[PDB]
């Protein structure tokens, strides 16, 4: 998995602020690693839109990340609930 992440862009992407952190993966989760304020300024100037799919975005917003137990939605079924009694 590590070497697949490092080579998935067609070249050797280092684990450094000049490597993985330069992708277009979301401003809020990119700024949480390094170069926070510069990333925010560039996102403001370019008007980037954050889909809030990352773990870091929901951690910042204090909401259940779509990971592990949050990777799905639990819903009540009216018909089954009536069916039980």
């Amino acid at each position: 998995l590590l070497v697949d992440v490092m080579t998935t862009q067609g070249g050797l992407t280092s684990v450094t602020r000049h490597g993985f952190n330069r992708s277009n993966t979301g401003a809020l989760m990119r700024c949480s690693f390094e170069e926070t304020v510069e990333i925010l300024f560039e996102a403001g100037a370019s008007a980037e839109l954050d889909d809030c799919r990352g773990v870091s975005e929901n951690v910042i917003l204090g909401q259940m990340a779509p990971i592990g137990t949050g990777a799905f939605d639990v819903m009540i079924d009216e018909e089954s609930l009536v069916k039980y009694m």
Partner: protein, 505 residues
């Protein structure tokens, strides 16, 4: 009380849309115009109207409500103000971007130097990533120094097609500190590019031109990179943490905003009274320096704007960056409640998934249990026992939000529990608790144990479980976290339990 009922619908944030403030939006959202640098009036007992602590921006005293929303300091978010700048100034974080944009656009007519007629511009404009397209457009249009009012025809390089070019020579632009100096190639003419003319030439860029440069028509236009109206944060952003028990101590941002107001007033008076261009330029440079150091005090090359006390001023950028800044020090990782820490000792007589908890720690940490018909009797008994003896309850959270402290409540007599109330009670045996050793390098260093109350001052754990924790008993300390709801409790027992972590991935 927390926060009371609000009729507004409750949703979760799905998308964050970044951008830049337009001056008119800043003037629209603002609730007050700030004009005086004094925080307090001449009586030194009230908040000056129009000053930096305007009551319309939020209350600076607990005994008084916000003048705008009529809510206490608990509820009021704070409301922004605005300073109307005498002259435009550069945004310190966008000086390089402003330089690139003005280097990509004709400095006279506000049109991009190389239109689609050029061979390489089809390749450059076909780039879909906004940031890569700008890089290409810059690295191909930085070398052109004429507006090219007439260009060869695209069909064949024989006849000439005349576009809307103005036929002027573009200058070579460098930065000398906080200012951009342009040397026009001699048709050299070296002069400082006034932010007025840069703002004007940015405002003439066509929508198609700056939307090809990566900007947005709605959320961030290039001309909004120039500051003409400063948003003033409310006092919540910059609180006066007076620790002298009588003397108010203002935040660095308040002092910087006072300096900005002083420079703005000085420049306004100099312009109104008439003065030689030298003094006007000096005042303008001072205003630019104060604004830039307010937004970012770590500017390379320039000397730091020292605080009153001679120390460097803490700017907003310094407040945000660092392992101890907002992101890495208050959002990604923060201090939490319902936690304990103490020395650990081994116990061969404990089960693998058990942890021995000191009695005083068990009395301090509590779990809120919802009163139910199935547990009314034992919760009532714990409330009767009180908080001074274990097992017992420390608080009773009523449905109305009032919190009955069991200390000083025996005076009122016995409390009758109602279904739906909460009893915040001491953690008893068989409670799932997260248990951690701080140099946490993998998941198995944060497994979940079952509480066993013991009569001493050390956490007690099985010998076998010390290997995943990498913990000895030569003085090691470990931490304990108590879940506060049934969902967290359930997933902590069903996912992070010690037996489930025996075989590691």
């Amino acid at each position: 009380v927390g926060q009371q009922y609000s009729s507004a619908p409750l949703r979760t944030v799905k998308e964050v849309q970044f951008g830049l403030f337009s001056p008119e939006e800043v003037r629209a959202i603002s609730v007050a115009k700030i004009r005086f640098p004094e925080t307090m009036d001449e009586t030194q007992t009230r908040a000056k109207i129009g000053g930096l602590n305007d009551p319309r921006l939020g209350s600076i005293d607990r005994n008084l409500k916000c003048q705008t929303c009529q809510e206490g300091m608990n509820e009021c978010p704070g409301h922004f103000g605005h300073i109307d700048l005498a002259k435009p100034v550069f945004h310190v974080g966008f000086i390089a971007k402003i330089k690139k944009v003005c280097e990509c656009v004709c400095m006279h007519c506000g049109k991009l130097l190389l239109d689609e007629h050029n061979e390489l511009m089809r390749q450059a404009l076909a780039i879909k990533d906004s940031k890569k397209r700008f890089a290409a457009i810059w690295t191909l249009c930085k070398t052109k120094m004429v507006c090219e009012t007439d260009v060869p025809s695209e069909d064949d390089p024989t006849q000439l097609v005349s576009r809307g070019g103005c036929g002027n020579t573009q200058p070579t632009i460098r930065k000398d500190g906080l200012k951009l100096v342009g040397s026009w190639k001699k048709d050299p003419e070296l002069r400082v590019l006034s932010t007025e003319e840069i703002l004007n030439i940015f405002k003439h860029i066509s929508v198609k031109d700056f939307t090809s440069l990566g900007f947005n028509e709605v959320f961030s236009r290039p001309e909004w990179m120039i500051l003409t109206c400063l948003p003033v944060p409310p006092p919540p952003v910059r609180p006066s943490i007076s620790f002298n028990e009588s003397q108010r101590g203002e935040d660095d941002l308040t002092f910087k905003l006072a300096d900005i107001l002083k420079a703005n007033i000085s420049l306004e008076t100099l312009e109104h009274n008439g003065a030689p261009h030298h003094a006007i330029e000096e005042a303008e440079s001072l205003l630019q320096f104060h604004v830039a150091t307010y937004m970012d005090n770590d500017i390379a090359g320039q000397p730091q704007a020292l605080q009153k006390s001679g120390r460097p001023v803490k700017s907003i950028r310094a407040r945000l960056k660092g392992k101890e800044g907002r992101i890495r020090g208050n959002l990604m990782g923060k201090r939490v409640d319902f936690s304990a820490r103490t020395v650990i000792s081994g116990d061969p007589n404990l089960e693998l998934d058990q942890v021995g908890v000191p009695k005083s720690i068990a009395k301090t940490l509590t779990y809120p249990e919802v009163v139910t018909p199935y547990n009314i009797d034992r919760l009532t008994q714990l409330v009767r026992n009180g908080p001074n003896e274990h097992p017992g309850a420390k608080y009773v959270i009523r449905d109305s939000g009032d919190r009955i402290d069991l200390r000083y409540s025996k005076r009122a007599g016995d409390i009758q529990l109602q279904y739906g109330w909460k009893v915040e009670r001491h953690i008893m045996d068989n409670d799932p608790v997260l248990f951690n050793r701080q140099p946490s390098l993998h998941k198995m260093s944060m497994m979940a144990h079952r509480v066993k109350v013991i009569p001493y001052s050390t956490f007690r754990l099985n010998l076998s479980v010390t290997s995943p924790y990498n913990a000895d008993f030569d003085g090691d300390e470990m931490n304990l976290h108590v879940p506060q709801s049934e969902e967290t409790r359930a997933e902590l027992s069903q996912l992070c339990a010690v037996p489930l972590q025996i075989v590691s991935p």
